[PDB]
Design a protein around this ligand. Structure first.
Ligand code: 31X
Ligand code: CL
Length: 283
């Protein structure tokens, strides 16, 4: 069911990054019905089994807020996976680039440098929630939802992926125990017993909300991985960000209920973020 692309149509431009399993390139692609920019993942490695499984999954996950997969290229080696190109890169760097120090960090020609406002922060939040509502419905558990696993494209379009580049670029966001876990986004049951569910993803979503309203700060930045593990298991909650309205904090607190069945459903979270976004559109 996977779509196939001819290797002659893929025109490599430059390596964007390197994951453990592959290399990512910025490329030019002809006929995706004509010089369209794409993100091509080239497989390093048996693994031909994993490549097929992933390609079939990516072929099935099609949504407005899920990074677009356009197909594979089995004609030769390396094996290629073609995805849409999102100009603004990962959402953590984007938030960091459009925060309190945006004027200092901006290039001469950059358009209206300055922090993103409430409406924008809410527009990003609502779109991430929408992509998570889709996954929940398909009984799909992300496991690594964080701003680094989100992409931004022109016109503040925000989409969810799961990147191997994110594990490299943001290696500090993972803890070894070899399985690298994103402990700072995980609820206690996941840290304690590796219990990943839609309810652990809604917890991660609350942590993602905190990242949006702190403009990219690391959850528990003041703490070491072991101090963060004990804070999370003890039941400590992330302090309200200064840029965070109280009602948005109530949403986070909904996502962080100690018991997984007590946590707010992603649909309710989405409906509320959309309601707030809608109430600030003209003001
Ligand atoms: O390292 C990778 O695996 C990778 C990087 C990609 C980028 C990227 C481009 C420019 C700058 C970046 C900086 C930070 C992170 C990402 C980028 N853009 C697109 C795809 C990218 N992939 C392949 C991929 N692996 O899983 C997915 C995927 C998609 C849809 C649903 C679920 C999962 N896509
Ligand atoms: Cl509050």
């Amino acid at each position: 069911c996977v779509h196939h692309i001819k290797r002659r149509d893929i025109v490599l431009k430059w390596e964007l990054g390197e994951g453990a399993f592959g290399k990512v390139f910025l490329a030019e692609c002809h006929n995706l019905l004509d010089k369209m920019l794409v993100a091509v993942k080239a497989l390093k490695e048996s693994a031909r089994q994993d490549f097929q499984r992933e390609a079939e999954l990516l072929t099935m996950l099609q949504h407005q807020h899920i990074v677009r997969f356009f197909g594979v290229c089995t004609e030769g080696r390396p094996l290629l996976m073609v995805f849409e190109y999102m100009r603004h890169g990962d959402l953590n760097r984007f938030l960091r680039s459009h925060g309190p120090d945006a004027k200092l960090l901006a290039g001469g020609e950059d358009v209206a440098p300055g922090p993103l406002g409430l409406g924008q922060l809410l527009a990003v939040a609502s779109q991430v929630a929408a992509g998570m509502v889709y996954l929940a419905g398909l009984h799909f558990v992300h496991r690594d939802l964080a701003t680094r696993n989100c992409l931004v494209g022109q016109g503040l379009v925000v989409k969810i992926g799961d990147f191997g580049m994110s594990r490299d670029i943001y290696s500090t966001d993972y803890y070894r125990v070899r399985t690298m876990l994103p402990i700072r986004w995980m609820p206690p049951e996941s840290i304690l017993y590796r219990k990943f569910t839609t309810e652990s993803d809604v917890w991660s979503f609350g942590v993602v909300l905190w990242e949006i309203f702190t403009y990219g700060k690391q959850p528990w930045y003041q703490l070491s991985n072991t101090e963060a593990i004990d804070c999370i298991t003890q039941g400590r909650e992330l302090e309200r960000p200064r840029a965070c309205p109280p009602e948005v904090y109530a949403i986070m607190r909904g996502c962080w209920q100690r018991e997984p069945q007590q946590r707010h459903s992603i649909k309710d979270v989405h409906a509320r973020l959309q309601a707030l976004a809608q109430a600030h559109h003209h003001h």
